Homo-oligomer: 210 residues x 2
């Protein structure tokens, strides 16, 4: 789809290493295969938000800030603004705090020409308690607000089909084979960044992608 982001090879690197040297080292090796990297709080809190601009300049990659934004609207707006100012192309935002909290993020993204990803569900065991039961309604909330980018559940193929049904065929969906029948790109972390040679691990994972 022309109006949503193009992810090279449909593969997003989850760069979850927490020290700057390792993160830049392991990543550098793969920029030929990947142009989109997801970074989270452990790295940025440990090394500083300046690491975002460093990735983009050293690798020319798109950065998604996996910050799972989950505050009140005013604070969400400030988190998004600081994150985009640091150069993030996109930010991942929880839906469970409701529509106004999401809209605050969308407002800043529109102003700054950046993107918001709505996190509709999570896959860890604790997610059954409250998140699983809210997932469909959160996805619908996103659609109703004009959200165009979604992050779906790691596992359960049939959950992706359901999410894809709710959000429509045009919106952008990312998830951790069968998966790419519903998601537009897959997120891969450990398989690559803890590999003996990430360069080859990336290349192999990409071969698997049709």
């Amino acid at each position: 789809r022309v109006d949503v982001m193009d992810v090279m090879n449909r593969l997003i690197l989850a760069m979850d290493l927490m020290n700057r040297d390792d993160a830049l080292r392991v990543t550098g090796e793969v920029r030929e295969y990947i142009d989109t990297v997801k970074i989270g709080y452990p790295l940025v809190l440990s090394e500083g938000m300046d690491i975002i601009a460093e990735f983009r300049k050293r690798f020319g990659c798109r950065i998604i800030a996996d910050f799972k934004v989950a505050d009140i609207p005013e604070t969400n707006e400030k988190i998004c603004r600081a994150t985009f100012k640091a150069g993030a192309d996109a930010i991942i935002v929880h839906g469970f705090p409701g529509a106004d909290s999401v809209r605050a993020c969308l407002n800043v993204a529109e102003e700054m020409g950046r993107e918001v990803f709505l996190l509709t569900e999570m896959s860890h065991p604790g997610a059954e308690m409250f998140i699983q039961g809210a997932a469909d309604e959160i996805a619908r909330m996103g659609v109703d607000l004009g959200v165009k980018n979604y992050v779906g559940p790691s596992t359960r193929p049939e959950r992706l089909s359901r999410l894809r049904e709710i959000i429509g065929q045009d919106s952008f969906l990312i998830s951790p084979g069968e998966t790419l029948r519903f998601a537009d790109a897959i997120i891969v972390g450990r398989s690559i960044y803890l590999a003996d040679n990430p360069a080859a691990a990336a290349a192999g994972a990409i071969e698997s992608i049709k």
Copy 2:
């Protein structure tokens, strides 16, 4: 209660300013009145996590990191570890992602001798959609996990009494007069940091306390 934190004057400063100069300027001027300061992501993302150690050294204050931690367990562990390593005395964690995500935080806090606050509910309009309906169960989850520190709803007195009922009389509860009948300390932000005389605004808030 001896086994939970003593907050000076029962008043926590929500230092929500985003630039280091302003944040430090306003805070120093109230340290006589406040010994506990809550800081969030806008400041730390803008200025660096080193600002936490700066607050503690310049003012001798306790720092609560209002990071609303809301990830999977392994990532929560790492967020907490980085935040405590930077010097935070406590961290505020969401309960909606479930028990294992909260436990991950509790594990690191116990290891490092720090504290976890469970956020049981939020007060912004959107909180009605999913958070309000989960609040009692989240509070009970905390109790069942041995959580001793809670953050409650800004508004609605009767919500605080309900929370206090669930968590028991000994756990520590903070919230944004009637409030201190149920909460152990109140969180105050704009009233103070957007005041022409923060020193005076703090002093008045403390007098009314």
